Design a protein around this nucleic acid. Structure first.
Ligand SMILES: [Cl-]
Ligand SMILES: [Cl-]
Ligand SMILES: [Cl-]
Ligand SMILES: [Mg+2]
Ligand SMILES: [Mg+2]
Ligand SMILES: [Rb+]
Ligand SMILES: [Rb+]
Ligand SMILES: [Rb+]
Ligand SMILES: [Rb+]
Ligand SMILES: [Rb+]
Ligand SMILES: [Rb+]
Length: 136
RNA sequence: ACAU
DNA sequence: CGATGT
């Protein structure tokens, strides 16, 4: 139960669930924001958490970085491990964008390799993840 | 129950 | 209190 400070932390934020979804990744040690996705009009918490991890994998791979990724989402960690986002969200015209991004993230996982450890952020011991959106 |  | 997920 030691934080690995040399890591990337990601989190989703939303207005509603389902609702408007965004996500970001930060340097765990410094809090510096390294990437932020423009808000998506309709998605779920778990789809955003999944996209955040996959974006982190792509970000670190492009920069030849072996740092681990922290996420507080038990669901999204499993989905990334499985390379499959098992979302219940309806696929229709309103949800087309989030589903396109999820499909593309799965596609990336199936066509690329990575060694990045994907670690559970232990909120119960460490407080809220550094990438959190102070919204609850 | 657990994580969000 | 409501939701998404294992
Ligand atoms: Cl994305
Ligand atoms: Cl590690
Ligand atoms: Cl986990
Ligand atoms: Mg989270
Ligand atoms: Mg959060
Ligand atoms: Rb590379
Ligand atoms: Rb929050
Ligand atoms: Rb929060
Ligand atoms: Rb949390
Ligand atoms: Rb809760
Ligand atoms: Rb539940």
């Amino acid at each position: 139960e030691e934080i690995i400070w040399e890591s990337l932390s990601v989190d989703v934020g939303s207005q509603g669930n389902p609702g408007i979804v965004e996500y970001k990744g930060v340097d765990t040690k410094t809090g510096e924001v390294l990437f932020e996705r423009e808000p998506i009009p309709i998605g779920t918490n778990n789809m955003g958490e999944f996209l955040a991890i996959v974006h982190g994998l792509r970000y670190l791979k492009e920069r030849n970085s072996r740092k681990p990724i922290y996420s507080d989402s038990q669901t999204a960690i499993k989905w990334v491990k499985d390379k499959k986002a098992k979302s219940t969200l309806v696929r229709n015209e309103e949800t087309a964008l989030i589903w396109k991004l999820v499909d593309e993230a799965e596609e990336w996982l199936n066509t690329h390799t990575y060694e990045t450890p994907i670690l559970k952020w232990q909120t119960d011991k460490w407080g809220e993840i550094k990438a959190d959106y102070g919204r609850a």
